[PDB]
């Protein structure tokens, strides 16, 4: 069914939008009101597009796939990881590389090296070599730990990618549009509904609104695994 | 209110949907009323509404779309004038063109009223070709 009451969003930071002279006017038949230097998002079409969002997420996992979620902002960094360890999904820790989806051959070989270095890190032969080799392995393992630590459990492309709002990850988003991979994401008051093909326009100033829509879709995916 | 009242409506259509805005406000003269009457019934647009603002009866016209795409309307509308003021064109019931085989229509001014190629080909009448869309 996947409902959310209108009052649960209407109380929290959902209509609590963004700045009133920064609006990108492809929301001009969309945005409801404006108050005190902050936009007011129309919540009817918001919840309907979230109804559609959970229909098209739960249906896509009902076919049986693996989903992906991007996490980069450092305002919603660990909340995605909480929204991805229980939900079985593979996730971006803090920061993104341009090429992790489209140039995935070299990323795949980079996972050969990252898999071998985790195999050496577990095996206890790390203390054999002195501080030089241990320093190099800790540095490259730190950088791959920054990116590839959260997506070790993926081979191939996902079906639906859900991203940190719009700003920091136009890179990952445009790799998704080049690959054709459908994405269902969050929109601010001043961004594009036509980048992805369905997305969920709600402000992400609130951590609890991010925890709201992401927690909603986490139970959508886990009930997708419920089979 | 320039020189043409038909490049008025038409250029408001092209300039309307090339910026993807699904709403037109134009004047409602007799020939504009007739064109939108023979244009809503042919599936190009959705609705035409007369109203008033300072007791000046206008047409707001809702264009067609589809769903959330790269662009929410797939088939670009492609409106074009033919009989320019200063170069009038006139056709018999022979010359009257089947636009793209029929996927476009050629709205034209018969002695009856203004028709399409269907409603002026069966009549056998001919007249001044206003414009053809496709």
């Amino acid at each position: 069914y996947w409902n959310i009451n209108l009052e649960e969003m209407m109380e929290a930071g959902v209509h609590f939008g963004h700045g009133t002279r920064k609006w990108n006017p492809r929301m001009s038949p969309y945005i409801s009101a404006k108050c005190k230097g902050i936009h007011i998002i129309n919540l009817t079409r918001t919840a309907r597009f979230l109804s559609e969002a959970c229909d098209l997420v739960f249906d896509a996992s009902s076919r049986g796939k693996q989903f992906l979620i991007v996490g980069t902002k450092n305002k919603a960094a660990d909340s995605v990881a909480r929204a991805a360890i229980r939900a079985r999904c593979h996730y971006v820790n803090k920061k993104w590389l341009g090429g992790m989806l489209t140039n995935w051959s070299t990323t795949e070989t980079r996972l050969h090296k990252f898999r071998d270095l985790r195999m050496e890190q577990t095996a206890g032969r790390l203390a054999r070599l002195p501080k030089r080799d241990a320093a190099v392995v800790k540095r490259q393992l730190s950088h791959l730990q920054t990116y590839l630590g959260g997506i070790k459990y993926m081979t191939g492309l996902p079906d639906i990618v859900i991203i940190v709002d719009q700003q920091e990850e136009y890179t990952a988003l445009r790799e998704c549009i080049t690959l054709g991979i459908p994405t269902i994401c969050l929109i601010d008051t001043n961004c594009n509904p036509d980048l992805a093909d369905i997305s969920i326009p709600a402000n992400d100033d609130a951590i609890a609104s991010i925890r709201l829509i992401l927690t909603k879709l986490v139970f959508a995916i886990c009930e997708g695994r419920s089979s | 209110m320039g020189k043409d009242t038909i490049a008025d409506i038409i250029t408001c259509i092209r300039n309307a949907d090339m910026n993807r805005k699904g709403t037109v406000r134009i004047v409602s003269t007799n020939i504009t009323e007739n064109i939108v009457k023979i244009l809503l019934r042919e599936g190009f647009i959705e609705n035409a509404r007369k109203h008033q603002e300072r007791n000046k009866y206008f047409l707001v016209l809702t264009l067609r779309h589809r769903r959330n795409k790269k662009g929410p309307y797939l088939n670009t509308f492609h409106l074009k004038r033919v009989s320019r003021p200063g170069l009038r064109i006139y056709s018999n019931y022979q010359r009257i063109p089947r636009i793209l085989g029929g996927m476009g229509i050629a709205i034209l001014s018969t002695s009856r009223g203004i028709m399409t190629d269907r409603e002026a080909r069966l009549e056998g009448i001919g007249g001044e070709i206003l414009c053809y869309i496709w």
Partner: peptide
């Protein structure tokens, strides 16, 4: 086969991104 599956996915989504921008709300 993989490319075809990807295409089918994209179609599904575009239709899912075709049913309800019309109507709905």
């Amino acid at each position: 086969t993989r490319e075809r599956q990807k295409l089918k996915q994209l179609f599904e989504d575009a239709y899912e991104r075709c049913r309800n921008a019309p109507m709905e709300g």
